[PDB]
Amino acid sequence: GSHSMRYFSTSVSRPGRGEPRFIAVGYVDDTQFVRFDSDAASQRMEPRAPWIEQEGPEYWDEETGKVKAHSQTDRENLRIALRYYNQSEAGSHTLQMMFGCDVGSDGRFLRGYHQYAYDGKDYIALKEDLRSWTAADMAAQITKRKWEAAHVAEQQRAYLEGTCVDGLRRYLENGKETLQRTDPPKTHMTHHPISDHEATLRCWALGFYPAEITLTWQRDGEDQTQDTELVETRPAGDGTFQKWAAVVVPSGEEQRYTCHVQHEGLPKPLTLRW
């Protein structure tokens, strides 16, 4: 299977209440493994998955050094964005950054990411060719022109194609029993009349990993897209995920409905019926 590593960082300015809060978290696929919080007392990159704890002290020192440098950099970038957008120093603003890589089944590089959002909207993003940028607006174009002239993109390629791929490969082997597992959903159905002529059928997927899943209701073999109530996949809290899909059905007609579950952990997709 293909795999990904991501780091997600958030800087939030809080004028009059000190310096911006910086939080960064690291993920392999759907599993978090590290975090950094500028407000926390330790000022260390800290483990959040058991298989990363076996990294020696040079790892924790170096990763701490890197993430703290990023926190300083994005602090300054908050101030530059403030000037580019002609915004007052009174308000609270947010700079988000994501970076990482995807690898294929064979562990080889597929994609690298290096991208920012300011106040919740695209700012600048490294494009697929790893040579050019997509800027969202006129303020981001200033940065884009600066970074093109300085060849920022080229200077990130060693990390994206090398360090990131290599690290992801190491984590996937060290966390093999966790990260390469595939837990199929445990499924069931619930049925609740809502009047004397209608009833809810709810199809449940529980305990699955990875989070990617598809739950669809059909009636007499036809997809019920517009009438299905479908909640966002949600964490159980133990490292697995949950989802359900409900349809409101005329009573006595429950047998026309089927819920179809596709998950990478199922040899064949499931068809459930009440």
Binding site: A24, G26, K66, A69, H70, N77, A81, F99, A150, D166
Partner: peptide
């Protein structure tokens, strides 16, 4: 593995 980030907007 984190990356080094030093570039300014």
């Amino acid at each position: 593995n984190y990356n080094y980030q030093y570039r300014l907007f």
